[PDB]
Design a protein around this ligand. Sequence first.
Ligand SMILES: OC[C@H]1O[C@@](CO)(O[C@H]2O[C@H](CO)[C@@H](O)[C@H](O)[C@H]2O)[C@@H](O)[C@@H]1O
Ligand SMILES: OC[C@H]1O[C@@](CO)(O[C@H]2O[C@H](CO)[C@@H](O)[C@H](O)[C@H]2O)[C@@H](O)[C@@H]1O
Ligand SMILES: [Cl-]
Ligand SMILES: [Cl-]
Lengths: 291, 293
Amino acid sequence: IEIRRAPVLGSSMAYRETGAQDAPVVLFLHGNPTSSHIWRNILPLVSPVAHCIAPDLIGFGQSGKPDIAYRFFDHVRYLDAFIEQRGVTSAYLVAQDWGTALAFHLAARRPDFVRGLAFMEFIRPMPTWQDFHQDHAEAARAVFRKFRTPGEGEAMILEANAFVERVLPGGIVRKLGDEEMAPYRTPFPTPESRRPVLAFPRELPIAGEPADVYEALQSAHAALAASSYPKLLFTGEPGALVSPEFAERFAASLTRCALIRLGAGLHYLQEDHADAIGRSVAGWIAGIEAV
Amino acid sequence: EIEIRRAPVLGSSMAYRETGAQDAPVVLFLHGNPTSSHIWRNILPLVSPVAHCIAPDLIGFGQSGKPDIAYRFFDHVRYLDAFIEQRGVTSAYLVAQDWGTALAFHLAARRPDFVRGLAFMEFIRPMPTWQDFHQDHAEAARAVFRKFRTPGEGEAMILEANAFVERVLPGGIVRKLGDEEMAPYRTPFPTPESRRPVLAFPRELPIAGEPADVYEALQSAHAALAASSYPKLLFTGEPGALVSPEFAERFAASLTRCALIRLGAGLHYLQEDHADAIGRSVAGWIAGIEAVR
Ligand SMILES: OC[C@H]1O[C@@](CO)(O[C@H]2O[C@H](CO)[C@@H](O)[C@H](O)[C@H]2O)[C@@H](O)[C@@H]1O
Ligand SMILES: OC[C@H]1O[C@@](CO)(O[C@H]2O[C@H](CO)[C@@H](O)[C@H](O)[C@H]2O)[C@@H](O)[C@@H]1O
Ligand SMILES: [Cl-]
Ligand SMILES: [Cl-]
């Protein structure tokens, strides 16, 4: 699969594309601090049934690095512009981490765009720190509190590259090979290049802040609970942002939401479960399109 | 949790494995020769979160009863029909391989309203000549099955030598089964006479018009399959055995609502090499269909 590039809002976004184009479109949306790289072993399993498009968010992967704030709403604007530039009129969405917030927000604003939503390890408004990660992961809670602290977050993420070097491997059960880890590092050679990686944890909707993202994601979650398109939720054990127990309650709170149990898994489920995820998604799309 | 149970059927009994919530769609898993519901053991746990899974042992196979019958294709049809009635199943997805597919196609042709969807692989079709049985690189397989179908020779190979269990079975699996995995394939068949149903099957294969009744039934069943409107999922291995990848793409494209799922390296007993891929595929597919209805 070639990396391709699209002009977007006077910058550019890199993307991977595969599959016959007479088929329904599936948009794969990564989060922090990843790129379309994370889908690399899932795309070949979905491409036989769908036209797969996996963009790198602005400032991630091989996308352009404009001098912007990289707030959640900036990503929204770039992703919307990418979809427009690609001429995509409707799609399935497959999302993880911040990709899920983009998917939920897109579905809320354009309900007729969404053929279905496959998601995992998703972002929701979290009224307190007890709603961010699980009780066995107090240490993750403490790290993100630091990311959200002026000066401290800069030292950890911009200077020490902690999100790429510590958080990412900490959210994968297996140990990535050198050749698998390398493309996670290459987008972020410098402190300045790491700006988007610091901006994201500062956007997490926790304890009412930031108020604009908190409200947008409350609204997106209300829309999701009122939506009628098919949904497919994956969970790991014990997971990270989403426990198996929360996943069961969440899926039951929605209509037309299946829950697929992947087994031992933390945050970056794609890395531990690419085959299970790809096979599940391809079957699910095939089933929906049949009927 | 997966339970092994027994249903009374036509004066005998069939064993079956069952798992999943009772308020979910039913999925009926149908094995072929010389296997049992054992072959689905690693697939069931992956489908049970979305469906009520029922996996019977065909009459004379696995832990089912061994009544004094011919074990022809139409006998299996009768026992499977009676099992379905006994379990009070009114509609189901079918998941099938080998002779399981002939049973599924024949069921779907008679009762298409019963079929929620059909997931199948390595399936039986009418074969006008021996050239239509396996691929030309497997001449050895054709000679072996010709001998199975030959009076006297088949008895020596399958009943006395247990060749279907000991050679044909492992021969259609890419990996080597662990001893604990292979053992339950042997235990239903302790004696030559217990192997009667295993010998009966190759002699039922619809090759060159013989047997005429099965050939006719499977022609009619294949015509129905070609016209059918229910969702279908075809899995293929490379090179496969009864179904080549090239044949699979053409066959799937010919049908209405048929997705093709390529599994990679595989022979005949694809479940043993690809349980995870098959289970995950079937679960996502059922979830998708039931979401839209
Ligand atoms: O039933 C399989 C699977 O489908 C889902 C949606 O993917 O639920 C659908 O089917 C249920 C049983 O028929 C219905 O109760 C439900 O309303 C419908 O959306 C999954 O929830 C379920 O595991
Ligand atoms: O489209 C994905 C996948 O679905 C199948 C059926 O499972 O085809 C369906 O979708 C096609 C594209 O929308 C339709 O043209 C077709 O009629 C419908 O059955 C598979 O064939 C396909 O790979
Ligand atoms: Cl983050
Ligand atoms: Cl046979």
